[PDB]
Amino acid sequence: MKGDTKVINYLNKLLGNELVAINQYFLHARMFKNWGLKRLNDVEYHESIDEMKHADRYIERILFLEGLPNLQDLGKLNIGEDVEEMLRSDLALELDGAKNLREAIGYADSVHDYVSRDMMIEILRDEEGHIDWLETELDLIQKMGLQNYLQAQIREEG
Amino acid sequence: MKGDTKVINYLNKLLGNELVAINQYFLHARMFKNWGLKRLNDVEYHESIDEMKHADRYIERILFLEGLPNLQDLGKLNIGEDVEEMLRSDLALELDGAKNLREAIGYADSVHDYVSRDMMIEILRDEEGHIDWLETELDLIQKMGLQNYLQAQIREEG
Amino acid sequence: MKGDTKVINYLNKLLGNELVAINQYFLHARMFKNWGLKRLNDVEYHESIDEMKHADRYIERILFLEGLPNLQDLGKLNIGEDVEEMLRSDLALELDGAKNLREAIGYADSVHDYVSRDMMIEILRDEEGHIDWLETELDLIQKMGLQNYLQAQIREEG
Amino acid sequence: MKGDTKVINYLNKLLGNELVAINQYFLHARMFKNWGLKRLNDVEYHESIDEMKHADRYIERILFLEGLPNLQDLGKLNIGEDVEEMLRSDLALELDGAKNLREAIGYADSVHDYVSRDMMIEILRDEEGHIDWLETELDLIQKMGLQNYLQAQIREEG
Amino acid sequence: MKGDTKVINYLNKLLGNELVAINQYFLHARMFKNWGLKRLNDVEYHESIDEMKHADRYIERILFLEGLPNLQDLGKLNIGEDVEEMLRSDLALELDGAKNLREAIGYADSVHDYVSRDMMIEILRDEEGHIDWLETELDLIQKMGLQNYLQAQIREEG
Amino acid sequence: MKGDTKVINYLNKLLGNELVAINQYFLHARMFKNWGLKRLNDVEYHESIDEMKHADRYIERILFLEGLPNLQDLGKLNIGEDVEEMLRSDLALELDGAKNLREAIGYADSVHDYVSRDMMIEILRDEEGHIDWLETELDLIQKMGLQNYLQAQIREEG
Amino acid sequence: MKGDTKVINYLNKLLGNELVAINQYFLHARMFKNWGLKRLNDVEYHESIDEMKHADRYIERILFLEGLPNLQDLGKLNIGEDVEEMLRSDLALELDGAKNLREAIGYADSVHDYVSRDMMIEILRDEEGHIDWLETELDLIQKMGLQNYLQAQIREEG
Ligand code: HEM
Ligand code: HEM
Ligand code: HEM
Ligand code: HEM
Ligand SMILES: [Fe+2]
Ligand SMILES: [Fe+2]
Ligand SMILES: [Fe+2]
Ligand SMILES: [Fe+2]
Ligand SMILES: [Fe+2]
Ligand SMILES: [Fe+2]
Ligand SMILES: [Fe+2]
Ligand SMILES: [Fe+2]
Ligand SMILES: [Fe+2]
Ligand SMILES: [Fe+2]
Ligand SMILES: [Fe+2]
Ligand SMILES: [Fe+2]
Ligand SMILES: [Fe+2]
Ligand SMILES: [Fe+2]
Ligand SMILES: [Fe+2]
Ligand SMILES: [Fe+2]
Ligand SMILES: [Fe+2]
Ligand SMILES: [Fe+2]
Ligand SMILES: [Fe+2]
Ligand SMILES: [Fe+2]
Ligand SMILES: [Fe+2]
């Protein structure tokens, strides 16, 4: 079904956000894993998978709307050197993606692409979750201190 | 453990190949899926996952050797417009990756990084499999003709 | 038990046929497998195993009759370059083996080696089956055409 | 994938070794079985199957590398007349095959055919096992004497 | 159904062989059992049962063909005094029975009694097995020596 | 099978490394266990078992190659007095063993002892793992501080 | 708990005996295994494990008593060249260890270290078992002769 050009454009831009998140989250995960912070690797890895599911959704939708998914262009990854900096980088990235999602959702509604909109709201809800997780971790680091925070990631949570 | 700089370099270059394959294979998969060629989507999707496993291996190894995995730079994706062109593109990409693997493996051996080498040979064996699959599909297209080939992908293989 | 010399001779000659069939059928099988004609590989492989069972029977019988099984001499393999030629080669080979079996069976009967004869009739019945399979495939190729025939082998039969 | 001509050549030569072993081992097995040395038949039969698996590996690889597997030419079988002579013959044959494998493995490495090399090392490890088994049996014959050795093969080992 | 007189005659003669074998084998079995050669008792007992099955077959067939089964006349039993002599006696008896079976089978064929013939060939195949067993045991006695042979029968084979 | 003298020499030297590791790791394990650092005892004990498996491999291979395994000579154990010093000692020992393994692997390859080489690469991969574990623990001690590190070992990891 | 110095000394000396036994028994085991004497390898391997359990007991006890377990010093291994010599060597070693155990046990009692003593008596009981096994095997070799003895080890005992 021929979709609206600007919707497909937004979809590609959002897809673009997803696949920077996928890489940044995945590298972060395996950095944590290397440092033996087993728990941060499990969670951050899981978020990489979430982002993939998002990307898959955009791709299938763009294709359905008869546009060309663009996986060529990759945004700036901002990879940290320590736990805080890296969590803080994921948060800024989540926040930027959420801004773009808000914009796209409003636009989809006004050209009547309600199913694209419905898909994007589900995704936004997921993002809002990722944001909540990051914010809480970052505050915990400050509340309990870095050393205790680190000790608390050595063991995977059941 | 501090690894050899040129090994890490090769590892990053190989990682780079993996993540172009991941994207190209994934987009291809969902293109097939859209066209209703269910079987090509299953197989090509599976190869995307294989490539991810490869990437994960490089990342963990680079990190272990204390280098910086580079997920920033993305090579040229060559996406086709029809089944043949797209399979043919995956094949040229596999072949180029195999060339790089051969060089890296020989180099790892000469600096005594036998476990990197052992990892890369396992990967090369997987690639050689992907190559075999592509070659066979491409020949089948020619042997049975395009129409029959297409009909043969409509149904997922049990 | 000392057997009749000419029976043992026939048994060795028949054994000889078996082990050309074993090789030709096995190579054929893996040629098909390579070309992705999964179904022809399953069937032709199974016929290789049948031929092995036959060879085993001759060997044990020759040894029982106190002769020397001869696995040294190998007849001409005629390996094809395409499906038809290769099936057609297996058929001519089956037919020649059947001719030899008929001659041996009659001879066994006239020197009273009824159990060798009984073994050879069971084997001949198997051959007659292999012959039937080849004949049917070759006719199917002509009835439905080569392209359709080929498409029909891509998937293993449950 | 077009392989290196001399690798394919080595592969065919190695295949050639396999299929002499297959025959010699199989005939040996059924000779033992006839003599009621049940245990030597089980083991030697199993080694025949191993050799077949090896042959299958070469054939599929040669075909993959786009060469022609040669099952026409059969080397000299050296079949013994008694247990020792026959075991001793299998050992010399294993040793010759191991020499050829060493040479091929080194050559594969230098033309960068690492997956052929990897396959051949797995095979060589198997051969080294067959060699170990033969050596031990031959020494046991000498340590316990022939009569006791023979009595020890009457019953299949659980 | 009225059968051919000479077939019934052969059937009775063959029946006659069976029931000498039944007795000789059974006595042999229990002689071994007494001497504690548990394994020879199991095997030889089993052969007694086989012979009974044979006798049963003849009796039912003779009766079906409307002749009178003759269980009155019993041939010469040749019972040994030691393992070898006794095995050797069973072998000569098997060989004589096989000679008679060959004659009868040929005769049945020429008067068109194909089902009697078919029954007799099945039986002959069984005899040929009994013969193989005896021959192998007798050779084992010579290969490993009498003392080792005897020790090897003390324990029933699982 | 007569192996190459210098390979057997390397094998003995490597065996020698294994059995110092076995002792040092085992003593370390039970020191931790005494101090109530349950988790370090589980891990370090497991590494002792790994080293044993390694030693077993060398011994069987040396014997197979017809050399004499030397378990007489024992290197310097360097046992620590506190967690860090002891982990740090295991690390230096792992690193030295890895150096020797690299030397031996290269040598095996050049005398064509590919199966010894294949065994040693598997082992080296294991060592590389032990090294990774030590490095991570040592860094964790520094990141979270000694007190928190210690508290984190009181409980065995599920 | 601070233990008595001379008890710890005895404990280390006894530990010392254990770990020579561990090595000698293990090498012996794998020598038998190589020669195909499967049964002697199983038993002798099991005795190596027993000795390890003993060593573990000493180490934990020494540590508990606050002494330093000494795994540095290794006594003379006396490795045989044939089954008898090797069994005979294990026996002399067991006997010497038993002498040391008797002295230590008496000493523990007189300084009131009853739990060390209780541990050592359990161990002595195990040794006495190992001694019984060796003595019986050595006598069996003489009673049945070497050839029969050897044949009797070819098969693992269920
Ligand atoms: C380029 C860096 C990437 C890495 C290192 C990576 C890594 C991984 C790994 C290790 C898995 C686990 C395989 C499994 O068991 O399912 C996975 C799953 C998956 N990946 Fe990726 N991935 C990457 C990018 C992508 C991209 C670009 C896509 C497509 C938009 C994608 C789509 C998926 C999907 C759909 C799954 C299945 C999730 C599940 O069902 O568990 N990935 N990824
Ligand atoms: C020419 C003399 C040969 C004899 C007498 C022989 C005999 C046998 C027998 C009796 C079996 C058991 C069937 C089963 O249950 O799988 C077998 C299995 C097999 N044979 Fe052969 N064989 C011969 C040569 C070959 C050759 C030349 C090849 C191809 C290179 C081959 C390939 C195989 C394979 C792949 C199996 C399956 C093994 C398994 O999965 O158990 N054989 N052979
Ligand atoms: C004269 C000496 C014979 C002796 C000492 C003997 C002994 C035995 C014994 C102990 C059994 C085991 C019973 C059971 O559990 O089935 C048996 C079974 C049997 N007997 Fe006999 N037998 C003799 C002759 C015969 C004859 C002349 C026939 C008829 C032709 C015969 C027919 C059978 C049959 C059909 C079985 C059943 C086998 C089975 O199903 O296990 N026997 N015999
Ligand atoms: C140095 C030469 C040694 C060799 C070649 C060796 C070999 C082995 C092997 C192959 C195992 C089997 C692993 C398993 O499945 O449990 C084992 C087990 C074990 N080893 Fe050792 N070992 C040696 C020395 C030691 C020492 C010095 C100790 C400590 C005093 C020790 C303590 C143990 C323990 C406690 C087990 C577990 C037994 C079980 O639960 O099955 N070993 N050994
Ligand atoms: Fe989630
Ligand atoms: Fe997302
Ligand atoms: Fe997100
Ligand atoms: Fe795969
Ligand atoms: Fe890859
Ligand atoms: Fe690939
Ligand atoms: Fe069949
Ligand atoms: Fe056949
Ligand atoms: Fe056939
Ligand atoms: Fe095997
Ligand atoms: Fe082989
Ligand atoms: Fe072999
Ligand atoms: Fe039977
Ligand atoms: Fe009978
Ligand atoms: Fe009989
Ligand atoms: Fe481990
Ligand atoms: Fe090790
Ligand atoms: Fe290690
Ligand atoms: Fe025990
Ligand atoms: Fe002990
Ligand atoms: Fe002991």
Tab-separated table of C-alpha atoms in Angstrom, chain A residues 33-38 146-148 150-151 154-156, chain F residues 39 132 136 140 142-145 148-149 151-152 155 157:
chain	number	residue	atom	x	y	z
A	33	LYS	CA	30.469	-8.145	30.727
A	34	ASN	CA	34.235	-7.870	30.352
A	35	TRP	CA	34.509	-5.848	33.588
A	36	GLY	CA	32.573	-8.608	35.314
A	37	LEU	CA	29.540	-6.452	35.994
A	38	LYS	CA	27.386	-9.424	34.966
A	146	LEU	CA	30.070	4.004	43.072
A	147	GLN	CA	31.841	1.198	44.914
A	148	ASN	CA	28.649	-0.282	46.340
A	150	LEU	CA	29.603	-1.758	41.270
A	151	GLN	CA	29.602	-4.564	43.811
A	154	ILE	CA	28.761	-8.606	39.975
A	155	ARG	CA	25.959	-11.164	40.203
A	156	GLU	CA	23.126	-11.624	37.649
F	39	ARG	CA	32.893	-18.071	46.199
F	132	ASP	CA	40.389	-13.325	31.747
F	136	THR	CA	38.561	-9.195	35.974
F	140	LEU	CA	37.048	-5.516	40.539
F	142	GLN	CA	40.390	-2.006	42.747
F	143	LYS	CA	37.030	-0.694	41.422
F	144	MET	CA	34.849	-1.593	44.412
F	145	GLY	CA	37.538	-1.658	47.109
F	148	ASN	CA	33.242	-4.772	49.389
F	149	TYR	CA	35.116	-7.243	47.270
F	151	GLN	CA	31.910	-9.248	51.310
F	152	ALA	CA	30.977	-10.240	47.768
F	155	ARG	CA	28.184	-16.504	49.445
F	157	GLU	CA	27.193	-17.901	43.290
